[PDB]
Ligand binder design. Structure first.
Ligand SMILES: OC[C@H]1O[C@@H](c2ccc(Cl)c(Cc3ccc(O[C@H]4CCOC4)cc3)c2)[C@H](O)[C@@H](O)[C@@H]1O
Ligand SMILES: *C(=O)CCCCCCCCCCCCCCC
Lengths: 586, 30
């Protein structure tokens, strides 16, 4: 099909297997610390590249580009909030998780509160959140990229992709995945930078982009279907806030208070609390190296704006009648959906803007991002299931058995994702991305609050945490069931949900659910038994450095002050740069 | 006209002030 693209992807696979087998020769497998924690032998650059590579994915490319096309810049906030919470992790949550010596976050709640129902319920919630908000993202986005760019078939494609990533995460463990995440982050950044350069050159540069976007509206607005007719001149034209990152608090998608607060909550979960990112930060050689990896991942998390959001706007510039279409039949003829065809921004940029060798390179960038994210999810899920369930159910099992347990759990989660693929194919346009951020906002905030109080409030107890979690779950479902039931649609076909339900954006609901769950924990804790202090040494941010003995209701973080000053300084510098970029883009 | 690279400096300024006060309370309150 392509002479040079074949060799470029071959060299990509070559580097992949090379770093993989280099780590095999260096893996030191046979212990859970090896397979689930890389033996805690990871340094700054692989930790940072692993965080970035696992978080970045096909979902980021397709979603950020399509949203930039349809709406405008604002969606970049999703990425940039990470730059703060990641630091919170590296400086607040990772030290505790290190000085507690846990392999999972449910394990941390198991040995910080005490009991078998918190660990169980949180592991189950984490698994479901991974199936809904993470694997569906990447499967959907690889599906779109293949359906447009290549378009030979979509089931076979993503099934093969999951097969290769299954083999990858089975063989690897944390060491392989973090070294090959160095090489994959290199690949992703290089390719995406080249494509950004080409797009800026074709539009005429930053200035050429900021000039032509608000006039990037489609011309075909008839809708021969008599129901819609002459379209509002409001939903086929770009928003006048397309160039702004802080939209209106009420009459604007992604309102700024929602952005800041709600993403801080959901992202405190997404980084500081969930097993994927923390487990990237548990395989660290030391604490200082983990902080270095956090600053690196943050600096890279300032990147996906210019590499995914602005290219989507460029797509709307060059192909407005095809990505910015509104008319149901037109968009259906262009993509197959009748909701806007915004997702085709990045794939059509790649297909119509770059030559053969760079066609291969872009396919490799997409492949690397999807593989790294799925490998992260599968290994972290292996960690969670193996440790929590298999220990609560078979507390005396050899590591030659636990390795087997995790290895097979990878196969099972792959089969589950293949089974759930059609339920993901039933979403249209941006609907999936909305749905997933909504799921997170409904189900994350209680977990977020529980971890905040676990690390920062000694008082809370088993009743505290369990009842906050259950109350948060019921409150979240109260809104998720009806809202998801009524359906979804665009200006052409808007679903008839009540305004008091749909009118409150899911991030404001995340704030309210956060506060309800936190208040409920504090309430039902302050009117029940407390937990003594002897149980909480090296389990709360107050007692990090305690050397005294713990009661174990069921370390040695000494960073040299010099490198500590260095990593502190450049972390603060990273935040200064991120805050600048927030200001520059409104 | 308030250009965006002015907003950037304003945001950096308020961030620097916030961090300076945080380090002050660390130095005194710990
Ligand atoms: O869960 C919040 C965390 O999500 C992680 C993450 C998860 C999935 C996806 Cl796909 C993305 C990218 C994206 C694509 C399309 C989008 O469009 C939205 C907005 C309105 O329309 C729907 C939004 C985000 C990011 C962010 O990396 C982390 O920073 C956040 O803390
Ligand atoms: C304390 O004395 C034990 C029993 C607690 C009963 C009262 C709880 C008050 C909670 C107020 C916040 C509710 C948030 C929404 C929950 C669905």
């Amino acid at each position: 099909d392509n002479p040079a693209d074949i060799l470029v992807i071959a060299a990509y696979f070559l580097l992949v297997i090379g770093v993989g087998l280099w780590s095999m020769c260096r893996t030191n497998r046979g212990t859970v610390g090896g397979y689930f924690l890389a033996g805690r032998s990871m340094v700054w650059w692989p930790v940072g590249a692993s965080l970035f590579a696992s978080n970045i994915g096909s979902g980021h490319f397709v979603g950020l580009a399509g949203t930039g096309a349809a709406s405008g810049l604002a969606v970049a906030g999703f990425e940039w909030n990470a730059l703060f919470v990641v630091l919170l992790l590296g400086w607040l949550f990772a030290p505790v998780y290190l000085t507690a010596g846990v392999i999972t976050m449910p394990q941390y709640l198991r040995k910080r509160f005490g009991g078998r129902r918190i660990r169980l319920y949180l592991s189950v919630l984490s698994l479901f959140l991974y199936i809904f908000t993470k694997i569906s993202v990447d499967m959907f986005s690889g599906a779109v990229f293949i359906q447009q760019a290549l378009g030979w078939n979509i089931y076979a494609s993503v099934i093969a992709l999951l097969g290769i990533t299954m083999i990858y995460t089975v063989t690897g463990g944390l060491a392989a995945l973090m070294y090959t995440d160095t090489v994959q982050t290199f690949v992703i950044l290089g390719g995406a930078c080249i494509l950004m350069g080409y797009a800026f050159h074709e539009v005429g540069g930053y200035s050429g982009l900021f000039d032509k976007y608000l006039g990037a509206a489609t011309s075909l607005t008839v809708s021969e279907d008599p129901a819609v007719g002459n379209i509002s001149s409001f939903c086929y034209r770009p928003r006048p806030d397309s160039y702004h990152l802080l939209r209106h608090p009420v009459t604007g998608d992604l309102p700024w208070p929602a952005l800041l607060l709600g993403l801080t909550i959901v992202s405190g979960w997404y980084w500081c609390s969930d097993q994927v990112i923390v487990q990237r930060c548990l395989a660290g050689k030391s604490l200082t190296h983990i902080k270095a990896g956090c600053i690196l991942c943050g600096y890279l998390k300032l990147t996906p704006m210019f590499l995914m959001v602005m290219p989507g706007m460029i797509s709307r510039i060059l192909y407005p009648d095809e990505v910015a279409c509104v008319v149901p039949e037109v968009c259906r003829r262009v993509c197959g959906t009748e909701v806007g065809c915004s997702n085709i921004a990045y794939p059509r940029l790649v297909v119509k803007l770059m030559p053969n060798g760079l066609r291969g390179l872009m396919l490799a960038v997409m492949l690397a991002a999807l593989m790294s994210s799925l490998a992260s999810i599968f290994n972290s899920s292996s960690t969670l299931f193996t440790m929590d369930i298999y220990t609560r159910l078979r507390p005396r099992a050899g590591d030659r058995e636990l390795l087997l347990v995790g290895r097979l759990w990878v196969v099972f989660i792959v089969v589950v994702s293949v089974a759930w693929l059609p339920v993901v194919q039933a979403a249209q346009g941006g609907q999936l991305f909305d749905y997933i951020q909504a799921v997170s906002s409904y189900l994350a905030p209680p977990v977020s609050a529980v971890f905040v109080l676990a690390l920062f409030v000694p008082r809370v107890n088993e009743q505290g945490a369990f009842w906050g979690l259950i109350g948060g779950l019921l409150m979240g479902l109260a809104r998720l069931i009806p809202e998801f039931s009524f359906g979804s649609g665009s200006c052409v076909q808007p679903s008839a949900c009540p305004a008091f339900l749909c009118g409150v954006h899911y991030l404001y609901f995340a704030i309210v659910l956060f506060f309800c769950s936190g208040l409920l924990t504090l309430t039902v804790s302050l009117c029940t038994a407390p937990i003594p202090r002897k149980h909480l040494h090296r389990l709360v941010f107050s007692l990090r450095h305690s050397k005294e003995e713990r009661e174990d209701l069921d370390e040695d973080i000494s960073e040299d002050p010099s490198w500590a000053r260095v990593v502190n300084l450049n972390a603060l510098l990273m935040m200064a740069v991120a805050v600048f970029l927030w200001g520059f883009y409104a | 006209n308030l250009q965006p690279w002015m907003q950037g400096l304003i945001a950096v300024a308020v961030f620097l002030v916030l961090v300076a006060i945080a380090f002050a309370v660390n130095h005194f309150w710990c």
